[PDB]
């Protein structure tokens with residue numbers, strides 16, 4: 001099936017806990033895969049205009065590890081619940097992808113999760129201004145704008161609203177698309 005095929009591809013890139021104990025400032029992100037209308041989509045947040053770090057930017061759900069978290073996957077799931085109302089029974093964590101090093105002292109660990117078909121996002125307005133889906137296939141043929149820094153522009157055909165996706169967030173979206181969609185019979 002579509003979903004079994006995606007998880008099988010993803011597992012081949014799982015690094016597991018290999019880099020998890022190193023002495024960094026630690027953050028996790030959840031890359032949430034949603035199936036709709038026979039295709040896979042990624043779920044993105046727009047950060048509230050009132051936040052300290054990067055107000056109004058497009059990001060995946062995530063945040064800083066705290067002492068309660070059993071592991072890095074737990075960080076991602078706790079944060080996703082707080083931001084968009086995703087409960088643990090509503091997500092299957094499939095793997096841990098290559099981590100992102102920043103600022104010489106920070107390590108960000110990305111997890112890919114498959115989302116239940118009955119999940120409906122409840123944006124927490126203290127943290128998130130908006131939540132939206134993008135088809136995974138978009139990231140194979142994006143609409144690119146050069147700011148040089150490459151920026152993706154996605155327009156939602158339901159309402160005509162355009163979102164800008166850039167940086168680590170855009171890079172991780174492309175990676176997931178390549179892993180799942182490369183070399184497929186039509």
Ligand SMILES: CC[C@@H](C(=O)Nc1ccon1)c1ccccc1
Nearest residue numbers: 027045047059060061062063127
């Ligand atoms: C690790 C932090 C995460 C984030 O802050 N997620 C949030 C917060 C409110 O809404 N979405 C993120 C992911 C990707 C790029 C920048 C930041």
